[PDB]
Structure formats: C-alpha cells, structure tokens
Amino acid sequence: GMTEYKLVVVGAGGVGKSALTIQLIQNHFVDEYDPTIEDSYRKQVVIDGETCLLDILDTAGQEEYSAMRDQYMRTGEGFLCVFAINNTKSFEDIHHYREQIKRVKDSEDVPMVLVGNKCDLPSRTVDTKQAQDLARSYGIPFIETSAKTRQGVDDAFYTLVREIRKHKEK
Ligand SMILES: Nc1nc2c(ncn2[C@@H]2O[C@H](COP(=O)(O)OP(=O)(O)O)[C@@H](O)[C@H]2O)c(=O)[nH]1
Ligand SMILES: [Mg+2]
C-alpha cells in the first residue's frame, strides 16, 4: 500500500513555519498563531502518481529536554528549512540547522528544501542569489514562498517529498 513520510519544518521563530503548515493543511492564512505551540498534522496527497500520507511536524524551538529534539530529527525523513527574506539572522541560522540535523542523524545525505518565506513583504534583505548559492552548496532545492498569497507553498512541501523519495530509492 501507500507510505507515510515524516516531514519536519524548522527555522527561527517568526519565519512563518506555522503559517506555511496551516496553509497546506487548512487552506487559509493564519495571522496570529502562538509561536510557542508545536504540533503535528496529517495530510494524504498524490505526488507523481503515487499516494502519500504526510506527517508534518511544525517545530517551535527549544524542547523540555534536548533529547526530544534529537528524537524528532532522527525520525524525521525530510526537513523544510525556512527563513524569512526580510530577516538576515534567520538566513544565517540555516547554517546551524543544516549542521545540527546532519549531526543528530550522523549523515551526510539528509533530504532538505531551503525555503525563503514572506516574499510578499517589502524591504528584502536576503537576496535570491545568496539563497541559491547556499542551497547549491548543500545540493538541495531552493523555493521562495508566501504563506499569505500561497506562492510556492504546495511546491515546497511536494518538492521535499520528492527529495525524500530520491534519498530512499538511492
Ligand atoms: N506578510 C506575510 N506574513 C507572514 C508570512 N508568513 C508568516 N507571516 C507572519 O509572520 C508572523 C510569524 O509567522 P508564524 O507562522 O507564527 O511563524 P513561526 O514562528 O515560524 O511559526 C505572523 O504574524 C504571520 O502572520 C508571509 O508569507 N507573509
Ligand atoms: Mg509557529
């Protein structure tokens, strides 16, 4: 039968992890969602003719115990690494997320997609070239998104599934 995949959405507080996840799951933009809530959601989709069940963890940062962070990174099969295009610190944080996930999984080959969110807002500080160069250095896709307009949202999640499939079918 069909397969379930564990996706994990990571990134600095305020980049739009919850807004992106809720758009995919519930098809609306949520303006105020408590930044300290971490929850998971299921969604069945068909990608490349094959039916999937996505189990998506919307992370929120520090855990009661760091061992719990390590556990969700170990069971996670692919990671949406989200920054906001108007927040340079959130982009620099991607370096740390890439390192930490590889470190916890003790692996050099971890499915990931780099997501630059909030493209509909003014005063961008992270240029597309910067992000394209970084994703290229990791060997992963880069997608620009807006949780408000839905630009790129489905693309980002479905591309991550394709990356998971490529890793498993190696
Ligand atoms: N304009 C705009 N605002 C966004 C976008 N994504 C998130 N936000 C806003 O950014 C703030 C933080 O988003 P949230 O989903 O809570 O970020 P999280 O802490 O990563 O889960 C909220 O006020 C959201 O409405 C976007 O693509 N465009
Ligand atoms: Mg959140």
Numbering used by the authors: 0 to 169
What does the published report state?
RAS proteins are binary molecular switches that cycle between active guanosine triphosphate (GTP)-bound and inactive guanosine diphosphate (GDP)-bound states.
Crystal structures of GDP-bound KRAS (1–169) in two different crystal forms were solved, both diffracting to a resolution of 1.45 Å. From hereon we refer to these two structures as the Mg2+-bound KRAS-GDP structure.
